[PDB]
């Protein structure tokens, strides 16, 4: 038998139970997004912690992050999206970075995963 380690083992949601992500695996998750006509975006924030309230159901803190420049309306190649992750990690090298994707017909998000850790 074996024991799961309960000390200092945080997780970060989707695709966080697999071996660490490498290049040519990030570029293939953006091609699948563009051929379904969705809009990419970027975000960053120093600390990923959450809080609560005494007696209010459905309320939590720490769900909003900062937007890099603006959503990219009209992107058609996976080069301009892979060249904007380097400018962000050279100006704020001590923060997290996460990638999104929007849909306007149903007004919901479709993807989210981390690409950098401090």
């Amino acid at each position: 038998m074996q024991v799961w380690n309960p000390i200092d083992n945080p997780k970060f949601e989707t695709l966080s139970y697999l071996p660490p992500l490498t290049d040519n695996q990030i570029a293939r998750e953006i091609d699948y997004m563009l051929r379904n006509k969705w809009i990419p975006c970027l975000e960053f924030d120093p600390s990923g912690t959450i809080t609560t309230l005494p007696g209010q159901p459905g309320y939590y803190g720490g769900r909003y992050w900062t937007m890099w420049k603006l959503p990219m309306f009209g992107c058609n190649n996976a080069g301009y999206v892979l060249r904007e992750i380097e400018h962000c990690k050279n100006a704020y090298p001590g923060c997290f970075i996460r990638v999104l994707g929007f849909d306007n017909i149903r007004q919901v998000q479709c993807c989210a995963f981390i690409v950098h850790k401090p």
Partner: protein, 464 residues
């Protein structure tokens, strides 16, 4: 004038040249007449005892207009492969129903016509609700998008589990198995249908112990967790006392059974969850007594179009591959009436009419019952990205415990959502995606051996 006597039904209730309006309700029956009765006398009798009329003539009918309050039959077609079965169509006006009540609609359609002495069988198949009638209801409290926004979860189907054995555990030991399962990587966990309040465990001693474990398990991984709390009772006062304690503790979701509690207590709870900001999970019990047989009862696609108008966020739907009966082409057909916004007629999937919901929120289907890891790349391909998957016996039966058993159901799931967005087929190659992932995770190879040839295959009863 007024003449006392007995006449036929066909002279008044059979008009096969009638054009339907846009504010009418339509229904379809599949009947079997009794020897010695014409097929056109049974269809008229079915429609002439659900709206107005009786077995003899009365004198009080001259004070009103009866050409704007009757039900009519306007089509008959025989079935293929039999000799004593037909299909009939009926139309009802709009001024016959009460706004905002579902228990009234059923009472006026399936009230008494099911026990006549001139028939041997009857079954209801479909219905058509006009848009002028759906606007008087409230609908689901939150819907689909508002539920995903609150929990901050996108990309993959959710996961859950239920606690076994069904009955016999204490109150402190019951809150200890929840923490182990929740710290492993699961999103939800669930009580059971028949656990309300019993001498071995009371209802106020379980809430506290569950709440204590949820907070402890939430601050260790850094994700939002939840738990369904059962709220069924035997009185409408005891039911509203158990839903006010969860609001005080700050819990996000509750549970109810809508077929044994009734169609009246469900609307009251749905009207309160909306005003206090909670989520509702619906369990379908005692549903096989009306369904299953193909020559008597009511289809499930009709029982599912009333829950949307009544109120609810989750609904059970069953699994095609499991220990309970189900069929693929019918499930794929009646799963589209729960999520979409405009469906079209299709007789290859059971749909008879055309339905639109004029911007009403949808519901999330749920699949559960007798499944394990080897069934994973067959459930992602059918349902899609909006479902809930529940493993009850596949988690607590792991040879190593509870926490190691939950790390095996998440790796086996995140490896299928990654091989799909690369251009690989999930049907032909399904035993090769859960054979390469079991080479870097020691907790999945230890589980791919206990259950390896356990399959359920049997004959089907309800053949389309």
């Amino acid at each position: 004038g007024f003449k006392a006597g007995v006449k036929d039904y066909r002279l008044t209730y059979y008009t096969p040249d009638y054009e339907t309006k846009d504010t009418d309700i339509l229904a379809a029956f599949r009947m079997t007449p009794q020897p010695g009765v014409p097929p056109e006398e049974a269809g008229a009798a079915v429609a002439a005892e659900s709206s107005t009329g009786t077995w003899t003539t009365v004198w009080t009918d001259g004070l009103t207009s009866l050409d704007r309050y009757k039900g009519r039959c306007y089509d008959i077609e025989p079935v293929a492969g039999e000799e004593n079965q037909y299909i009939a169509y009926v139309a009802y006006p709009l001024d016959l129903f009460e706004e905002g009540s579902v228990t009234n609609m059923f009472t006026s359609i399936v009230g008494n016509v099911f026990g006549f002495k001139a028939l041997r069988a009857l079954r209801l198949e479909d219905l058509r609700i006009p848009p002028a009638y759906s606007k008087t209801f409230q609908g689901p409290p939150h819907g689909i998008q508002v539920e995903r926004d609150k929990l901050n979860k996108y990309g993959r189907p959710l996961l859950g589990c239920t606690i076994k054995p069904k009955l016999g555990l204490s109150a402190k030991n019951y809150g200890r198995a929840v923490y182990e399962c929740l710290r492993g990587g699961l999103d939800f966990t669930k009580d059971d249908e028949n656990v309300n309040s019993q001498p071995f465990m009371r209802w106020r001693d379980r809430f506290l112990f569950v709440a204590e474990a949820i907070f402890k398990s939430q601050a260790e991984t850094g994700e939002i967790k939840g738990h369904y709390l059962n709220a069924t009772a035997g009185t409408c006062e005891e039911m509203m006392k158990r839903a006010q304690f969860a609001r005080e503790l700050g819990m996000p979701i509750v549970m109810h059974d809508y077929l044994t509690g009734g169609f009246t207590a469900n609307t009251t709870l749905a009207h309160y969850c909306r005003d206090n900001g909670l989520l509702l999970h619906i369990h379908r019990a005692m549903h096989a007594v009306i369904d299953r047989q193909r020559n008597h009862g009511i289809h499930f696609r009709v029982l599912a179009k009333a829950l949307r108008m009544s109120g609810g966020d989750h609904i059970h739907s069953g699994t095609v591959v499991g220990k309970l009966e189900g069929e693929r082409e019918v499930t794929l057909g009646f799963v589209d009436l729960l999520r979409d916004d405009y469906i079209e007629k299709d007789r290859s999937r059971g749909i008879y009419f055309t339905q639109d919901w004029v911007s009403m929120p949808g519901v999330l289907p749920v699949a559960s019952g007798g499944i394990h890891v080897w069934h994973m790349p067959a459930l992602t391909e059918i349902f899609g990205d909006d479902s809930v998957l529940q493993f009850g016996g596949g988690t607590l039966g792991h040879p190593w415990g509870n926490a190691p058993g939950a790390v095996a159901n998440r790796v086996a799931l995140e490896a299928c959502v990654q091989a799909r967005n690369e251009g690989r087929d999930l049907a032909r190659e399904g035993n090769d995606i859960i054979r390469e992932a079991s080479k870097w995770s020691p907790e999945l190879a230890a589980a791919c051996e206990v259950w390896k040839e356990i399959k359920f295959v049997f004959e089907t009863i309800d053949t389309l």
